[PDB]
Structure 1
Amino acid sequence: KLVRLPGLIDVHVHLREPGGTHMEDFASGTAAALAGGITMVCAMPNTRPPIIDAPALALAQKLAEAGARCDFALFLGASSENAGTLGTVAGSAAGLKLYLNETFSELRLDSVVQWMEHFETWPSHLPIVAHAEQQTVAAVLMVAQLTQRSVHICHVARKEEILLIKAAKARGLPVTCEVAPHHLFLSHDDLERLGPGKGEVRPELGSRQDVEALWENMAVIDCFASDHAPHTLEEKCGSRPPPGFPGLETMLPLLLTAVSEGRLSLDDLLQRLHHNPRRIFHLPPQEDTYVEVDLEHEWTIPSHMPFSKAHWTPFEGQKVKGTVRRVVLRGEVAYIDGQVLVPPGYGQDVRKWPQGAVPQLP
């Protein structure tokens, strides 16, 4: 009665470690990942301190190796000062992340020339990923063409963005992209329920026409990724609400509900949560790793999922059909019906595996 899936990959998560101000860490975030059927995560570099140099990467590597319950890779972050300085550690990271719109001071790039410098100095065979909204998508595509290499666009959220990427792909340009579940299953219509605090996210929630454009152009979407961005309700309901939603535990149930409704096929889902993440970021296989899901149980998303320390969710009240029953990670039972059974530190840095290095010419 259960369906066996491969180990699913989430290439866009914020686990807030290193850092001292948030409740989420590698241990709680990867517990949430396992409960969502996710056995490998790529963690973003906008931590405190941000992962913008080799010492910060070394610290984060050890914190994750000690806390992670599933396997992982860590992004490096582009800064106004580190272009040309990351060559010796670049291969050990998931890739390079550029924050091209709003971000905090250490990751801010003040000029497209700084984008160009990163595209020119980052090793050409390694992934580059960009937070790029609206016209910024076109701008970074231009920089990628000027430097003759590929780029991956995070969380595409608008009709404008997906149609631009569609046009670029039709001209044969090397661009891939990812879409997050809140931009497929939430819209402006939900802001009345969520309110202006909880509803804050970047890219912002789109119109009904944005959501319909993403579904209509599913063929253009290479990956799904949660953009798990945990903040507590104390932050979201405060005077300066930070943007972001938690999403590791809800993403697969939401997408399996869409499969059961015929909105996409099981294959469409597995291309975007397994095969394409593997090939875009050259993430290695996980031996003896699989997820068992139950597609019969209908349940309502509660006010908070059990594991993420965010302790809230914007999908509260939505009806879903699909449950993660069991996760096996490298031969060990990692999750069964609401209980995580692997300790912090079970997870490993996949870039240190022999099959986890990105191939390159000598």
Structure 2
Amino acid sequence: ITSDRLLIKGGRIVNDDQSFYADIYMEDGLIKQIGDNLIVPGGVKTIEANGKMVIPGGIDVHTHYQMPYKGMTTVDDFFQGTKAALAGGTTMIIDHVVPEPESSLTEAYEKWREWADGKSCCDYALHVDITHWNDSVKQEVQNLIKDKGVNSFMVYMAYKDLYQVSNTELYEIFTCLGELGAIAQVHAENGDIIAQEQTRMLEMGITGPEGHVLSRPEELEAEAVFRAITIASQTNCPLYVTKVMSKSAADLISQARKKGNVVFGEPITASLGIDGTHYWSKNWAKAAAFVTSPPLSPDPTTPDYINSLLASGDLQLSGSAHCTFSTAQKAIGKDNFTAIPEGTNGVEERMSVIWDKAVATGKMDENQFVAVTSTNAAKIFNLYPRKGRISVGSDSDLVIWDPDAVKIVSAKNHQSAAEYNIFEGMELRGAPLVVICQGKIMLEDGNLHVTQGAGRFIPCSPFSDYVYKRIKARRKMADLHAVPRG
């Protein structure tokens, strides 16, 4: 875990629970001291913060680095993708292991570990996607939680005849994951109806990217979410809705939380920063750059409403779902949108987008910003307070943040290998100046200083208090009752 001593002076420290002035001293990957007039060795490297903010580093809970799809890989791998993370203030990522149906979960995990251990600039952890379900899979799941530092698995309600699962299967999986202390994630979209609406759009000769969005209107995201929430509630399992893109999906989550259901919602940079009118762009490749599932909503009031609910705590946390394909790989579907590979950028811009859209607009303050950028992630995934908090003993991943900075986003300038950036030409308030990860300065003066494979896998235990205390209480509370009769 070795790093130099590091001292940051005159900083204003912003955590999710309060802000305060103090100096921070770091050593060997851990924060050692916080306060004034700190007693420290001489000739230690010192950064002068001058009252600029110091925050916990971002935790992007959703990535797809160098993800397999049909004999291709996404263009940003674990190395270049995490450079893109650190560039934008994110010091940890959580990626999705995707086993082939009938493939082994554990084998896919080993493989993903090898890729990541070897290339990642920063710490990371892993979700494991359950792309098919049967008795051996159920055993692997158990083994991954016990021996492998996984506590999060994702099922698919979409992709009919590929990954899609029946209602019985959902019920059995949520029952299992709940019993084991895991988080049940969902890709919540109704694959059965989408299959029909795709065929209808193609019969109507709408093969461009506009047919992607039109074949998955938000009604079908909504339905899938309502069903998942229902089943998660019958099986007393926590649910986590990934990639929240529509208003109606976010209402349902808000509505379910108020009722007392244990549900989390994960908007992504895309839904928080832009909308879906660009599927209608005359430039085909630009339209295809936005193809991701679920799609960006065409209702332009959507980004504002999603930031409003992230501000209110009705959505709890943000990720990016970074999946990047080259113009060339996207072109594979130039005659049929269903063949366009799905994914966009967003890892580098996540924090800037939310600051620009939710903070600078007076929706949330800097403390709730930290929450939705790192601190809630940490609690959900059982990384708290090691991550998502500046306090003594916590890992020394953190960021000096400039609320008055202004940047234009361009593909010209971004770390991503892709030629397109869906936020191209956008002007964002708020950006990082300095990034420390693992106690080491990894960004300063617009220069990255990274090392490939430095990142460690962070094992995530199950049963995080944040998620499971109310579930435990409900389990034990339960005493159903016969009516005793003659």
The alignment's TM-score, normalised by the length of structure 2, stands at: 0.68
Q: Which residue of 2 aligns with 1:69?
A: 121
Please report how far the alpha carbon of residue 192 of structure 1 lies from its aligned counterpart in structure 2 after TM superposition.
4.2
Query: Counterpart in 2 of 1:16?
Result: 66
Matched, 1:323 2:323: no
* 1:191 CA displacement: 3.6
Unaligned runs of 5+ in 2: 1-49, 189-220, 388-394, 469-486
Partner of 1:97: 154
Larger Rg: 2
Structure 2 residue corresponding to 1:84, chosen from 131, 138, 146: 138
Question: Which residue is 1:40 aligned to?
Answer: 92
User: How many correspondences in the alignment?
Assistant: 355
User: 1: CA distance between counterparts of 2:103 and 2:120?
Assistant: 17
SS at match of 2:423: coil
The CA deviation string for residues 180-224 of structure 1, in whole angstroms up to 9 with x for no partner, is: 121122123344457532221211111124334323433211001
Q: Does 1:358 align with 2:465?
A: no
5+ residue gaps, structure 1, are: none
**DSSP 3-state at the match of 2:72:** coil
Per-residue CA deviation, residues 205-247 of structure 1 (Å, 9 max, x unaligned), is 1112433432343321100111111111222344232121111
- The residue number in structure 1 matching 2:455 is 347
Task: Give secondary structure in 2 for the equivalent of 1:114.
Answer: helix
Letter in 2 for 1:325: L
Q: Which moved more, 1:65-74 or 1:11-20?
A: 11-20
- Asked whether 1:113 is paired with 2:205, we answer no
**Any conservation in 2 of the 1:302–1:317 contact (CA below 8 Å)?**
yes
**What's the CA shift for 1:293?**
2.0
The residue aligned with 1:59 is 111
Cα distance change, pair 121–223 in 1 and its aligned pair in 2 (3 A): same
- Distance in 2 (CA, whole Å) between partners of 1:75 and 1:252 is 22
My pick for the range that moved more, 54-63 or 229-238, is 229-238
Q: Distance in 1 between matches of 2:428 and 2:307?
A: 18
- Residue 173 (structure 1) aligned with residue 261 (structure 2): yes
Q: How does 1:1-362 map to 2 (within 5 A)?
A: 2-17=52-67, 21-22=72-73, 23-46=75-98, 53-82=105-134, 83-85=137-139, 86-91=141-146, 92-102=149-159, 105=162, 108-122=163-177, 123-132=179-188, 133-193=221-281, 195-206=286-297, 207-218=299-310, 219=312, 220-238=314-332, 239=334, 240-258=339-357, 259-284=359-384, 285-286=386-387, 287-351=395-459, 356-359=460-463
Report the CA distance between 1:47 and its aligned residue.
Answer: 6.7
Distance in 2 between residues matched to 1:268 and 1:236, nearest whole Å: 36
Distance 1:296 1:104 in 2: 49
Q: d(CA) in 2 for partners of 1:304 and 1:98?
A: 36
Note the C-alpha offset of 1:63: 1.9
Between the aligned residues of both structures, percent identity stands at: 22
Structure 1 residues 52 and 44: CA distance shift in structure 2, 3 A = farther
Give the partner amino acid of 2:354. Answer: L
Once the 2 structures are TM-superposed, how far is the Cα of residue 249 of structure 1 from its aligned partner?
0.9
Please tell me whether the aligned partners of residues 134 and 160 of structure 1 are also in contact (alpha carbons under 8 angstroms): yes
Specify the code of the residue in structure 2 equivalent to 1:84.
K
Aligned residue type for 1:162: A
Question: Does the CA contact (< 8 Å) of 1:7 and 1:290 recur in 2?
Answer: yes
Q: 2 CA distance for matches of 1:190 and 1:165?
A: 27
Determine the C-alpha separation between the residues in 1 that align with 2:67 and 2:131. 19
1: CA distance, partners of 2:153 / 2:171: 13
What secondary structure does 1:263 align onto?
coil
In the alignment, the residues of structure 1 paired with residue 329 and residue 315 of structure 2 have an alpha-carbon distance, to the nearest angstrom, of 31
Take 1:271 and 1:50, find their aligned partners in 2: how far apart are those partners?
A: 38
**CA contact under 8 A between 1:73 and 1:94: conserved in structure 2?**
no
Check conservation: 1:130, 1:152, Cα contact below 8 A.
yes
